[PDB]
């Protein structure tokens, strides 16, 4: 399928995907696990649109063909993902019974750009969402897929603690963290509590705020500790004297 | 890289003097850190910088400590020495940022802004589509279309 | 301008590189970093950057900036002597060569 | 300003004149005060046991 010089690869891959899926659906004894991340993208339209029919009919001049393709852009109906040959293969396995050989453990992605009822234009320097999708349309795994839905939340505190402890300490052990400067950042407990407040314990939020911790202004702990250790050392030096 | 046009270079010290406004703006510093971390390299100079600057910001509305006059001028010279230390700690950072950014852009098949070096790829400054038809600093004529630093497949 | 876009492209490059077992560019990057990230030395008393002399031009004059630029232009980072780069330099914080990094781990085994 | 030299910095009214004294610098970290107080007190007793 994939070992060819282009353009040949292009037609070869079509044939090859069709036959691959036709082969998969024909195997009834060997367990097969299909993992798709972001199934919810496969259950609605792709972002491609059917070519305007005038690309199919050939042309003499743009002058009079009765054709607008050069004048104005227009949207033609989106191509539904179910009409992708690959996704066709998979849907064929889901919908046909008499295939209890196959197990779809599959996932959803909410990675969409944010939209709250007004949108400006995103600043291109500061944009966390530039590689996010444009979707803005709701997805319900119950109605929109043939799979049994399982729900996942944010970390509870037991997860959250283990995870943060990892990110910080095993980060530092790998030479990726405060290192010799360790006395500048606060102690683990304080970081844990604060990053909890900031992140809401959402895992991506935890990762993100763990990095951002570099910039905290208003944390006073090490300051007051340092101060107390100092005072105690000087009382010790006055008692020795 | 979206910002392609010829630019004006500012001396490092004036860039650093922007403090919280740009050089130390939290937002910017964090994505520098992200770049380093992702490359699997400690960000020590960034952390030094962040420390110095964090504290700069905290005391930025206070008056400086009262000065007693000295023939020695030891105080004045010690304040100065500390200050130029910090300046240098930050020069090093500023250098690191420009360095790694150019290198990473070389890996990502990114074209830099006009008249910019990318060590392995464009030794003399890279240019394409400038307002001026020659390369500005070589004084050599520019080809059409814009010169390509990378082989074609994506 | 380093963008979140570039950070994502970076992540994907880094990943794809990890999975193809390409250790070389990681090593160039490690080298670069090791060289230029060393801790700069505390300056001797009496050492400061030159200011622009007063009573030369009026305070709103170009000459001021023209001086600053021309100074920093002359001190290139290859001329920074206050940061200790070289083969001579002992680097306690960092690993020395490729053989000490985790993807070599099989040779570290007894 | 105009064809005349700029005034020295001390000839302008205070830059932060409108910010209250409790804000420059902020005394934050109050949470810890009591803690260290107890701590130090405790330590004192420890340092008697050594002696006596």
């Amino acid at each position: 399928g994939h070992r060819a010089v282009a353009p040949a690869s292009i037609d070869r891959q079509s044939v090859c995907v069709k036959f691959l899926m036709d082969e998969l659906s024909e195997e009834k004894k060997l367990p097969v696990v299909i993992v798709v991340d972001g199934w919810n993208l496969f259950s609605h339209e792709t972002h491609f649109r059917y070519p305007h029919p005038d690309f199919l009919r050939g042309l003499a001049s743009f002058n009079e063909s009765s054709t607008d393709i050069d004048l104005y852009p227009q949207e033609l109906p989106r191509i539904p993902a179910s009409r992708l040959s690959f996704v066709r293969g998979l849907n064929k396995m889901i919908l046909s019974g008499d295939d209890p050989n196959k197990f779809f453990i599959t996932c959803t992605t909410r990675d969409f750009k944010p939209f709250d009822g007004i949108s400006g234009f995103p600043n291109v320097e500061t944009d966390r969402f530039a590689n996010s999708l444009d979707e803005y349309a709701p997805y319900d795994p119950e109605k929109d897929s043939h799979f049994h839905p399982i729900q996942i939340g944010n970390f509870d505190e037991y997860e959250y603690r283990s995870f943060l402890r990892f990110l910080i300490n095993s980060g530092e052990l790998a030479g990726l963290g405060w290192g010799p400067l360790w006395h500048a950042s606060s102690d683990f407990e304080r970081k844990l509590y604060k990053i909890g407040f900031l992140s809401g314990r959402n895992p991506q939020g935890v990762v993100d705020h763990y990095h951002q911790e570099l910039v905290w202004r208003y944390d006073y702990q090490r300051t007051r500790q340092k101060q107390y250790l100092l005072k105690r050392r000087m009382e010790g030096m006055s008692r020795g004297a | 890289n979206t910002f392609l046009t010829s630019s004006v270079a500012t001396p490092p010290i004036s860039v650093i003097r922007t403090g919280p406004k740009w050089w130390a703006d939290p937002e910017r510093m964090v994505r520098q850190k992200l770049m380093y971390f992702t490359l699997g390299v400690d960000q020590l100079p960034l952390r030094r910088t962040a420390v110095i600057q964090r504290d700069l910001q905290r005391f930025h509305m206070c008056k400086p400590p009262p000065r007693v006059g000295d023939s020695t001028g030891y105080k004045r010279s010690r304040a100065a020495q500390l200050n130029t230390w910090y300046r240098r700690i930050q020069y090093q950072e500023y250098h690191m940022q420009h360095l790694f950014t150019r290198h990473v852009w070389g890996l990502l098949r990114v074209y830099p802004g006009n008249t910019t070096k990318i060590q392995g790829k464009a030794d003399d400054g890279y240019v394409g589509y400038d307002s001026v038809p020659f390369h500005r600093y070589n004084r050599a004529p520019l080809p059409f279309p814009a010169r390509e630093l990378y082989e074609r497949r994506k | 301008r380093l963008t979140y876009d570039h950070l994502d492209q970076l992540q994907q490059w880094t990943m794809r590189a990890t999975l193809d077992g390409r250790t070389e560019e990681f090593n160039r990057i490690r080298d670069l970093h090791r060289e230029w990230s060393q801790h700069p030395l505390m300056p001797v008393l009496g050492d400061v950057e030159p200011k622009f002399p007063l009573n030369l031009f009026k305070q709103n004059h170009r000459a001021k900036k023209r001086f600053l630029v021309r100074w920093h232009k002359a001190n290139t980072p290859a001329n920074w002597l206050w940061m200790p780069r070289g083969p001579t330099v002992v680097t306690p914080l960092h690993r020395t060569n490729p053989t000490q990094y985790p993807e070599n781990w099989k040779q570290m085994v007894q | 300003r105009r064809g005349k030299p700029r005034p020295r910095a001390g000839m302008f009214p205070d830059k932060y004149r409108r910010v209250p004294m409790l804000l420059k610098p902020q005394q934050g970290g109050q949470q810890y005060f009591n803690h260290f107080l107890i701590r130090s007190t405790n330590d004192r007793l420890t340092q008697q046991d050594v002696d006596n």
Partner: peptide, 30 residues
């Protein structure tokens, strides 16, 4: 009154144990 955090600008933020640099490491220029 009690135990103020530093009341003054330009304090020592960052200290480390380092060697001294050479005298006049900066080239006079242009």
């Amino acid at each position: 009154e009690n135990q103020p955090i530093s009341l003054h600008r330009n304090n020592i933020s960052y200290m480390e144990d380092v060697g001294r640099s050479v005298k006049n490491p900066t080239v006079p220029g242009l």
